[PDB]
Amino acid sequence: HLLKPLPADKQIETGPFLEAVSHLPPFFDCLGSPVFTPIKADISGNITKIKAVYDTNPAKFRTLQNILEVEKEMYGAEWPKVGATLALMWLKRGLRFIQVFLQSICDGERDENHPNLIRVNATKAYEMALKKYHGWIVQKIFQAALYAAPYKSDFLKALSKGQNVTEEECLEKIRLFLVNYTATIDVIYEMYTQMNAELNYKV
Amino acid sequence: HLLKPLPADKQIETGPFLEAVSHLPPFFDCLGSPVFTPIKADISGNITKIKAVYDTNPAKFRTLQNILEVEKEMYGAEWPKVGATLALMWLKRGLRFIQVFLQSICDGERDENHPNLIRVNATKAYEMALKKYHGWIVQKIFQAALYAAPYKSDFLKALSKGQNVTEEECLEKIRLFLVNYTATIDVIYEMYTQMNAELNYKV
Numbered sequence A, B: 001h002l003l004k005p006l007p008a009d010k011q012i013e014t015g016p017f018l019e020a021v022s023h024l025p026p027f028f029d030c031l032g033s034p035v036f037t038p039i040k041a042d043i044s045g046n047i048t049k050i051k052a053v054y055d056t057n058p059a060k061f062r063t064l065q066n067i068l069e070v071e072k073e074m075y076g077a078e079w080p081k082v083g084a085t086l087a088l089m090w091l092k093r094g095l096r097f098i099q100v101f102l103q104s105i106c107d108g109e110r111d112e113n114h115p116n117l118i119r120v121n122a123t124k125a126y127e128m129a130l131k132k133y134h135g136w137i138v139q140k141i142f143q144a145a146l147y148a149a150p151y152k153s154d155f156l157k158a159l160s161k162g163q164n165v166t167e168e169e170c171l172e173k174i175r176l177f178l179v180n181y182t183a184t185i186d187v188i189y190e191m192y193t194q195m196n197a198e199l200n201y202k203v
């Protein structure tokens, strides 16, 4: 479930984007703990919200840019803290977490003392994508939750279950996925900047 | 939204029980933090599951005892870790948490160093109702989450907002609620014992 390549105009079609990222919450099951259940629910809830908006008028909401532009017009001063704009503001952070996490694993980043954990990789991704938006209590909850993360080898095997591929092949496929995925996330973040749609409030 | 008194036969009608406890998740908002959102979702999800079972045949599922008896018959060896029996096994723990927490506040239990927090009351309730069913990682997550709890005075005011009553009056109304609520929870727990429907697994 690769993302589509970016067109020259860098516009991201909403329908296909939603279809693609809808495949990402299931992989949370690959972490193997109920600790990750509310996480999968938050990301799913963002996707549901954006889809619900889109479905009201797919042509009006053809692209993610259209969502922001249209909602900016539709709403008052509560924008961008409303609607699919808010849902995508949070979704992009989760998407970026996943991106940074996977990229870190693929790049061979590891605690040389504990080379088969994924805590360093998840911590980096958390720092880069989400931490700034969490108050100290939520940050404490993340640090605790990371102990529930699987072994690296197990996580990777879970990502390729049934395919009977080597770890090296699994990582090559992740790297392939990361190309259009990273590009797409980067464009989304830049659009939030350009539209002055980004907020910095903590939860 | 008082619970009904217990009849001589101690049978608890499912429909009215569900209607009554459906009023309890909203009061989570009285804690004033997003930290409690996944908690309210778990308890709501149990109530939804039990209601969904009940709705298949309200007469068959007339009482909570009926639910356990019928599901024991309907299911194989997966019972009691299935169905509305499992949902109620977890719901009762949340209900008991609430009971112990409220009763502790009403009984004047406090950290004399910090008399306007509710951490001691919530810790006691957690220890008595849920802790045993949590692995160490989830227990760490609870301890962290408790820091998000409101001041006692604020929590109580939030429970009576609009009514313009004193704290003393608010607590008298809580104490009234606790009579049939405690009795009902105690019967539920005893039924799980009698039916050998209780499990001790940790999450």
Ligand SMILES: CCCCCCCCCCCCC/C=C/[C@@H](O)[C@H](CO[C@@H]1O[C@H](CO)[C@H](O)[C@H](OS(=O)(=O)O)[C@H]1O)NC(=O)CCCCCCCCCCC
Pocket (backbone or CB within 6 Å): A038, A039, A042, A043, A045, A046, A047, A049, A083, A086, A087, A088, A090, A093, A094, A097, A098, A122, A130, A138, A141, A142, A145, A146, A203, B034, B035, B036, B038, B039, B138, B141, B142, B145
């Ligand atoms: C039982 C004993 C007691 C203990 C219970 C305490 C439990 C406390 C758990 C707290 C955290 C649950 C995770 C969810 C966090 C969320 O609060 C945030 C903000 O969530 C956003 O809020 C907005 C309003 O401000 C809108 O409602 C958004 O919704 S809208 O659709 O309405 O616009 C919504 O996503 N999302 C987040 O921070 C994003 C989560 C992304 C995670 C990325 C993967 C990381 C994996 C990490 C590895 C560990």
Ligand SMILES: CCCCCCCCCCCCC/C=C/[C@@H](O)[C@H](CO[C@@H]1O[C@H](CO)[C@H](O)[C@H](OS(=O)(=O)O)[C@H]1O)NC(=O)CCCCCCCCCCC
Pocket (backbone or CB within 6 Å): A034, A035, A036, A038, A039, A138, A141, A142, A145, B038, B039, B042, B043, B045, B046, B047, B049, B083, B086, B087, B088, B090, B093, B094, B097, B098, B122, B130, B138, B141, B142, B145, B146, B203
């Ligand atoms: C974003 C950065 C990363 C950080 C994110 C990490 C977040 C981790 C949060 C973890 C905890 C969320 C709370 C939910 C816990 C639940 O896991 C448990 C068991 O839940 C049960 O599981 C069963 C299967 O075994 C069935 O599915 C039940 O469902 S069924 O309906 O299918 O049968 C379900 O209730 N319920 C519980 O432990 C019960 C909760 C009761 C709480 C009572 C009020 C206490 C208030 C406490 C004050 C603090």
Ligand SMILES: CCCCCCCCCCCCCCC
Pocket (backbone or CB within 6 Å): A024, A027, A028, A031, A098, A101, A122, A146, A149, A159, A173, A174, A177
């Ligand atoms: C601390 C664990 C958080 C890990 C979050 C990753 C779960 C999603 C996995 C996405 C895999 C998509 C790969 C497709 C090639």
Ligand SMILES: CCCCCCCCCCCCCCC
Pocket (backbone or CB within 6 Å): B024, B027, B028, B031, B098, B101, B122, B146, B149, B159, B173, B174, B177
């Ligand atoms: C650490 C905070 C957990 C508190 C859980 C209590 C929330 C539910 C309040 C129930 C109030 C019902 C009173 C009716 C009279």
Ligand code: NA
Pocket (backbone or CB within 6 Å): none
């Ligand atoms: Na690179």
Ligand code: NA
Pocket (backbone or CB within 6 Å): none
């Ligand atoms: Na007493």
